[PDB]
Design an enzyme around this catalytic site. Structure first.
Site: not given
Ligand SMILES: O=C(CCCC[C@H]1CCSS1)NCCCS(=O)(=O)O
Ligand SMILES: [Zn+2]
Ligand SMILES: [Ca+2]
Ligand SMILES: [Ca+2]
Ligand SMILES: [Ca+2]
Ligand SMILES: [Zn+2]
Length: 158
Positions: A113-114, A117, A123
């Site tokens: 995911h990162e 970006h 998103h």
């Molecule tokens: O955006 C992210 C990267 C996480 C993507 C993890 C992948 C899992 C399978 S697909 S996305 N971190 C902040 C929001 C997360 S949180 O609010 O849910 O705790």
């Molecule tokens: Zn993100």
């Protein structure tokens, strides 16, 4: 938004989480770049010294950019879109417990995911997409980009 205008992209792992074996950090990140190189003309190489395009950092709280982390939970990681300097760089919250499996927060999935970006993707609203904002574990062998991810990235590269 910005995209990388070259095909050879470098990354460097600035520091390593004590949450995981070193080799497993290397492997997770490498496999996460492969997800993207599989569907683009991009090539990714790990470097061990000097300036990389994408610097991979583990850090907690305030860590020198305007995007402070929040302790365990909540924001797991963030990354900057294509650009010089901090552009491209991917930061992972050390207050999470990073893992190879489902036990804490899966580094591979989060890194996919990162890095999206880092490549320029925003998103998705599709819960099936890796670029959906919310973390949900899926078996790291069952994982596939969604159609929506593939459209997004190919709309930027290739
Ligand atoms: O955006 C992210 C990267 C996480 C993507 C993890 C992948 C899992 C399978 S697909 S996305 N971190 C902040 C929001 C997360 S949180 O609010 O849910 O705790
Ligand atoms: Zn993100
Ligand atoms: Ca950079
Ligand atoms: Ca956090
Ligand atoms: Ca940790
Ligand atoms: Zn940061």
């Amino acid at each position: 938004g910005p995209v990388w205008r070259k095909h050879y992209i470098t990354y460097r792992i600035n520091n390593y989480t004590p949450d995981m074996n070193r080799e497993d950090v290397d492997y997770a990140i490498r496999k996460a770049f492969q997800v993207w190189s599989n569907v683009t003309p991009l090539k990714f190489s790990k470097i061990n010294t000097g300036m990389a395009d994408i610097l991979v950092v583990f850090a907690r709280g305030a860590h020198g950019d305007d995007h402070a982390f929040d302790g365990k939970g909540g924001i797991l990681a963030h990354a900057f879109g294509p650009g010089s300097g901090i552009g491209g760089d991917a930061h992972f919250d050390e207050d999470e417990f990073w893992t190879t499996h489902s036990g804490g927060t899966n580094l591979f999935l989060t890194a996919v995911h990162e890095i999206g970006h880092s490549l320029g993707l925003g998103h998705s609203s599709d819960p099936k997409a890796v670029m959906f904002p919310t973390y949900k574990y899926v078996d790291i062998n069952t994982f596939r980009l969604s159609a929506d991810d593939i459209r997004g990235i190919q709309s930027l590269y290739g």
